[model samples]
Target: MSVNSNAYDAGIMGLKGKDFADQFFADENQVVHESDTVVLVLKKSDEINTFIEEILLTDYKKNVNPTVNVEDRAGYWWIKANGKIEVDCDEISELLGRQFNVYDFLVDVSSTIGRAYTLGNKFTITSELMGLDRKLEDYHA
Candidate 1:
């Protein structure tokens, strides 16, 4: 199966959890909301499970924050206790593949969420998360 995580800038996607700003923010210009941000569209059962085990359920995270429950609304998997969805672009792409299609994600924080699967690595992208980067840039302009 093709994975989106291997795509361009995928390594820059997700955060280092609690140490994110500490890990990547030595310079004010390092992080950009449009370029460094990532949105994941997860569907596989094993992949999703791994994300939970390593990222959300680990003891390291537990020390810094409480374990969060996963919730499915419609076809999207969202983590509750917070409103809206946020995610690191690279984390999911690296974990999976650019098969999910790289899109500009605007996040107030890094969060893991999922989208249901369909045929092919190609997504219909009705949300046009595909072109969100330009839209975001346009909004800033």
Candidate 2:
């Protein structure tokens, strides 16, 4: 008796459908995630990720490992793995480039509404939530 399955991540191995299984699994019957290459997962509803999937393949094909996943209830969320997602650290800007804003946008409310809070004896605002400067502005601040 031989246990059969293949561990795969579309981001790293470029595996999809059966191409991966044909080459690696061979009906191995067990799969595992060897590494965590799924860097960005921009989840949203209303099929916007479908459009992102199209555009990423067209305009941003230079991106490393781009993927899109759709769901009936949880909705569409695209993935840009490896270092491809480093440029777009802020999901807000990513959506802005797509001509929209986060509807629920409830991922981290503190970073927006009251991120800056009082420290032990002083007021402090952490830089963890600070977004990168826009290069399109073409200026150093």
Candidate 3:
């Protein structure tokens, strides 16, 4: 499965629930509110195996050939996958990897919200927050 596939639509493709909340939420109180900036939920079931596989393969740079279970509670999506990857690396690569995670989240959120916001907006905010443009060109004597 590709990373861009809609996992929620695929997972619930043929399933129906007695209650609307059963489809996405464990309780009515978990429903996303207007004030919430981001909301993502995935129910624990065999249906989400492909979703977990795709995420680990695409994002974590790991190889896993085992089943994964997903669970949602208290407004968080949790996953268990069978895979491992090394994390120790040089400063530049480590920082790049961390930045990639943040960038990916922003991209996903922006896609869900349509074309009103762009990735450029995200980059601008990040630059301002880190004062990237004001950093010294040469810190070494």
Candidate 4:
């Protein structure tokens, strides 16, 4: 004799509801395109979530001015700005009261829509492909 060990509420591969349904039955032949200035996608985690709530909602908004939107999904977070969003790892570290670096920052971030550039501890994502050269220091030349 054997017992039925299947749990009714058990989720499939950490997905549920709309996410599970869409992914489970996704069309392989479909062409997908995302239109946005700067899209910051990150896997859901306690540390990253806290960083968003504290760093993004506060210091980022205060400085950036134009603002951004955050979508909390089942498995990940979707953050996007209409223009551009420049992030400083030092500022993030200061706000979170922890030592955060660009190396680990790239690890937590899953993907982005626009130009993603990292110079030392600075992270910039923007729709504009230009102006980066102008912002550089003349000391190099």
Candidate 5:
């Protein structure tokens, strides 16, 4: 008798849909590759709408990832692109012509694809895993 225990079929893998299923079973490390991509879910607001139009559409696409996709959902804006999307509050403040601290920067953000990290007034979303950075020896006590 074979026990087809669906233990492995848990977490994100279980929630596979038609469009995203290919990502799980692809020949290449699509799961790993997917991590390199970034997606930002921003709540709908005039401020965010302006940023998407003026900055993301103009300067961001030209300078950064050209294949970036921006979608306007009913309640939020969906922004997806490759590579690390670094956010410096001061830099954004300059571009948006308004002050932004890390807290304020995150206020409009509903969700994100990559791992989120923050230091000082800067925020980052990237594929880098936390496990790679810390050594097991450090935890020994």
Candidate 6:
């Protein structure tokens, strides 16, 4: 598995969904149930980019055999991955601060796809949170 190296605009947004399966057991016979779900809300754009750059580019080990794809959309970035992987959630936040001068943002590992472990984080920017000027409020705040 390989990681896709691509640059995205800062205004991109992020979204997440999950895939899962379930089965039933019986003494004589068993029933099998399979389904998938998306269990989260839209994530912040900056946090999503940080996750892809730090985790896929730097932290992931080739031995784990991971495949990563980075996608850019209007005001958002999307990440799709599959393979054996582990991620340090806190380290992602630290990296975001080091690279972007952003702190006090939220991070979360939203969903896992296939056998590959899924990870995600979100950073919220609001009027009160950023305290930017009124003119710039609509864009940054």
Each prediction's whole-model lDDT (CA): 0.40, 0.37, 0.34, 0.66, 0.62, 0.41
User: Tens-digit lDDT track for model 4 on 28-91?
Assistant: 4655474446677877777667777765777676766456688776678878777777666765
Q: Compute the lDDT of residue 140 as modeled in candidate 5.
A: 46
For this target, which candidate reaches the highest TM-score against the unseen true structure?
Answer: 4
lDDT of 1 by residue, 1-141 (tens): 886465445444654333457666465344534332223433436666555455445532544235244555455454432222223334444565644444432122244333323333212112224454664655543
Among residues 3 or more apart in sequence or in different chains, the pairs in candidate 6 whose N, CA or C atoms overlap within 3 Å are 11-75, 12-75, 12-76, 13-75, 13-76, 108-120, 108-121, 109-120
- For model 5, state the Cα shift of residue 64 in Å: 2.1
Number of clashing residue pairs, candidate 6: 8
Model 3 TM-score (2 dp): 0.20
Q: What is the lDDT of candidate 1?
A: 0.40
Q: Which stretches of candidate 3 lie over 4 Å from their true place?
A: 1-37, 60-141
lDDT of 5: 0.62
- Greater lDDT among 3 and 5 belongs to 5
Flag regions of model 2 displaced more than 4 Å. 1-34, 62-74, 78-80, 83-141
Model 2 over residues 88-128: C-alpha lDDT tens digits?
A: 22233345454443332324432222123443322222222
Per-candidate count of clashing residue pairs (backbone under 3 Å): 12, 7, 0, 0, 0, 8
Measured over all alpha carbons after superposition, the RMSD of each candidate to the real structure, in angstroms, is 20.9, 16.5, 18.6, 11.2, 13.9, 22.4
Model 1 weakest 10-residue run by lDDT: 119-128
Q: Between prediction 1 and prediction 3, which has the larger TM-score? A: 1
Q: lDDT per residue, candidate 6, 1-141, as tens digits?
A: 798856544333322122222234434444535322111222546766666576556655443224445545444554544322344445565656544422232233433332222335432222122233547635643
Per-residue lDDT tens digits for candidate 5, residues 85-119, read: 65555555655566655655545458766666788
Q: Predict model 6's lDDT versus the native.
A: 0.41
